[PDB]
Ligand binder design. Sequence first.
Ligand code: WCA
Length: 435
Amino acid sequence: GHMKITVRGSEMVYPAAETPRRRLWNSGPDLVVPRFHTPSVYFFRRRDGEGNDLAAADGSFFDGARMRRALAEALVPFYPMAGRLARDEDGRVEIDCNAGGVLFQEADAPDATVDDFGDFAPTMELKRLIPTVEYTDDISAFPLLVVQVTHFKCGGVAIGVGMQHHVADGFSGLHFINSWADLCRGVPFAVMPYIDRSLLRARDPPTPVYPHVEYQPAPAMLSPPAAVAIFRLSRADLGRLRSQIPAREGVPRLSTYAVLAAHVWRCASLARGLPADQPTKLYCATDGRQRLQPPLPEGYFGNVIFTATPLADAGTVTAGVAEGAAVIQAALDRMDEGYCRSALDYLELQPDLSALVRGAHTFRCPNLGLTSWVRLPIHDADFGWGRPVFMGPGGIAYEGLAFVLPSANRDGSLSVAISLQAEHMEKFRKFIYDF
Ligand SMILES: CC(C)(COP(=O)(O)OP(=O)(O)OC[C@H]1O[C@@H](n2cnc3c(N)ncnc32)[C@H](O)[C@@H]1OP(=O)(O)O)[C@@H](O)C(=O)NCCC(=O)NCCSC(=O)/C=C/c1ccc(O)cc1
């Protein structure tokens, strides 16, 4: 259906104090992440478990003025967020820290309730909860951060975030949002951001020592409307799925990501009807912070995304989750300090990094992307009126792109949010539970 959603006011929000005016150099990983405003949506319920109103003692519940004041404070240490994209003399995209501000707006949905969104699948209707950005040829023209706070008939609220990917990855993006939340809640946030990105500069001279398959063009089909859905697997399902894989003494244990990813990859491949000899490539975003040595400063503010790309004939992936999980874990296992360091050097040698940008052509059939949010603090944004009951991607712009989401409660379930061709989704829906 098409929900009535009325925007009651838009406002640019600026840092509430002096911030540095500068150009901020972007690292190779900053430049190869997707070129969108990464969409996320938060839902907050007006009543708790037992039916108590979650409004504060002063009657507030996501009061706009308060949120904007806290936002302005947050933008002082996180000042690149209030910047704009630009290019350096060489044509390399950078951030112009010019305190141009972020878009904040409020909306009302007078006839819809949080419950109407059901499972919170990242449909184009869910995307309506994030402000829309008009992309022209002037890359400096739009804010890097847009936010909408939407109020519902039930008293509940959605916060829709869109964060231009050059500025921050998951950890750094949520570091900002959660810090904003902390300020709004009336507590100082624990970790000041570290802004300079030169720590991720390549070595001089660059000395790559791997082919870096992750930056090579993805396989094409050997010589359509995209559906979106979300699927929960209970702790017991994930257990049973793991128990299907032989775990023998002396064989290193597969990660839950590798097992689940093998399952998703196998199901998508079967649903797409891939022949056994069709190559297929799975794109796995990997956090460099856990891999680089010495570790980066705790508050490093930027992208530290490296990419693991298992690649196999569809025959290997569909033969079973055991075989697919092994291929994925091997690809993950490659992602150590020396590999991530080599990748920085490799990216430095490229004449034009915009060519390596991951987008529609990257994730589309016969390939796949599976971005884990399992260890991101997506449920910690408490602005003063409680923790969210759901957080997920606002939409999924590319076919073949999927997310692993952790549960908002303690049940240890995981959900897979995914986009596939409509004809293929109909099969995927059945296959993901058909084990
Ligand atoms: C993706 C990998 C390869 C797979 O891992 P994962 O699903 O994230 O899970 P982990 O494997 O790291 O952690 C799970 C394991 O760790 C264990 N564990 C688990 N939490 C614990 C614990 N607190 N204590 C101690 N043991 C534990 C847990 O038991 C579990 O064990 P096991 O079942 O044996 O696998 C992992 O290495 C990794 O790099 N994860 C991070 C990937 C990442 O950075 N994704 C974000 C990309 S950027 C993006 O999407 C941006 C979004 C965004 C969003 C909002 C914005 O505003 C802006 C942007």
